[PDB]
Design a protein around this ligand. Structure first.
Ligand code: TSN
Ligand code: K
Ligand code: K
Ligand code: ZN
Length: 357
């Protein structure tokens, strides 16, 4: 258990929106991250880990056979066919090389899970696109084809005999795909903090509120923390982790932590509306290292400001590598609106977690 793994392959830059050279989900997202990791000297300190293509059986841990076959068929569709299909989904574009890159995007996470669970590395970060947290069992959504982290969680359970996986989603958007996949599953605890604004922020789902705690035996194992005002800062995220996520995490006792590492809550994002310093992500990453013997894998989700996303990745990477935590430029206190949201989520989860009482 020494070393921080990093997966990046050129294929992550080889699909894009064919009808909009200005699309925000673009190759430059990952290349800019890699450029900054290099100039900060962080890239050379990581252990390079090869990507691999996810297999059908691995995809089928989460996705239906019909959906896998349809997605596989997109590699041969005409551009008109790709346009028609993509219109059947919410906030998606397609490309002939989307499926292949999506398979490597999933597989990049699996490779890091292998290295971490076998103690060859302490932790890791995949610098991957397409993202995953909106993908659902049978549909694309939100620029995602396959649910990278949901597959990785079930893979870790099947292949590495992991009992309990914690998924932490700090992207500014709700990872509804992860929620749906594990809604009835108490072996995978999903926590998402996200802008919500009473449903008026994308993806506009009542299911993104804190009242959605899971179903059946999954009750208590889905935790949504919705922000109902813009402008949240590091102190709000730190308070969410201290009073809610980390108490539950220590009670849950996961053996692996997967992070839906989007950086659209960072100051500078064009649409996230939040004011989180990149340094905050050093702290949030640090906190998660205290769980699961530090067996921690981050995978890139959203974040559309190229520089802010790169800064957030670098801040997280410094913590994975064990560097001293940074000085925080903002206040350490939460705002009233954040305290309101945190209190409500705790109220909704109280019956399930002794640490919240
Ligand atoms: C899904 C998403 C962010 C996801 C994310 O960050 N998940 O983590 C943003 C959507 C709302 C968006 O902004 C958009 C932009 C252009 C567009 N077309 C060019 C038609 C369609 C949708
Ligand atoms: K989130
Ligand atoms: K769950
Ligand atoms: Zn996002």
């Amino acid at each position: 258990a020494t070393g921080t793994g990093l997966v990046y392959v050129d294929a992550f830059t080889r699909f894009h929106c064919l009808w909009d050279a200005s699309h925000p989900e673009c190759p430059a997202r990952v290349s800019t991250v890699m450029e900054m990791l290099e100039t900060e000297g962080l890239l050379g300190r990581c252990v390079q880990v090869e990507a691999r293509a996810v297999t059908e059986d691995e995809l089928l841990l989460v996705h239906t056979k019909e959906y896998v076959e349809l997605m596989k068929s997109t590699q041969n569709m005409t551009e008109e066919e790709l346009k028609t299909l993509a219109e059947k989904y919410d906030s998606v574009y397609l490309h002939p090389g989307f499926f292949s890159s999506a398979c490597l995007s999933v597989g990049s996470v699996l490779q890091l899970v292998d290295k971490v669970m076998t103690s060859q590395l302490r932790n890791g970060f995949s610098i991957n696109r397409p993202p995953g947290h909106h993908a659902q069992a049978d549909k694309m959504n939100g620029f995602c084809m396959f649910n990278n982290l949901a597959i990785a969680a079930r893979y870790a359970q099947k292949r590495h005999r992991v009992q309990r996986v914690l998924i932490v989603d700090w992207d500014v958007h709700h990872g509804q795909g992860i929620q749906y996949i594990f809604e009835e599953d108490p072996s995978v605890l999903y926590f998402s903090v996200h802008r919500y604004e009473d449903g008026s922020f994308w993806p506009h789902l009542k299911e993104s509120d804190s009242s959605s705690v899971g179903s059946g035996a999954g009750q208590g194992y889905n935790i949504n923390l919705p922000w109902n005002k813009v402008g949240m800062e590091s102190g709000d995220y730190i308070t969410a982790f201290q009073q809610l996520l980390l108490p539950v995490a220590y009670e849950f006792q996961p053996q692996l932590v997967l992070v839906a590492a989007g950086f659209d809550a960072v100051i500078g994002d064009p649409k996230g509306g939040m004011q989180v310093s990149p340094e905050c992500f050093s702290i949030l990453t640090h906190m998660l290292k205290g769980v699961a013997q530090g067996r921690l894998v981050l995978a890139l989700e959203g974040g559309f400001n190229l520089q802010s996303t790169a800064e957030g990745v670098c801040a997280s990477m410094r913590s994975l590598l064990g560097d001293p935590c940074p000085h925080l430029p903002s206040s350490g206190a939460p705002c009233e609106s954040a305290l309101k949201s945190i209190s409500k989520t705790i109220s909704d989860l109280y019956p399930f977690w002794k640490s919240l009482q």
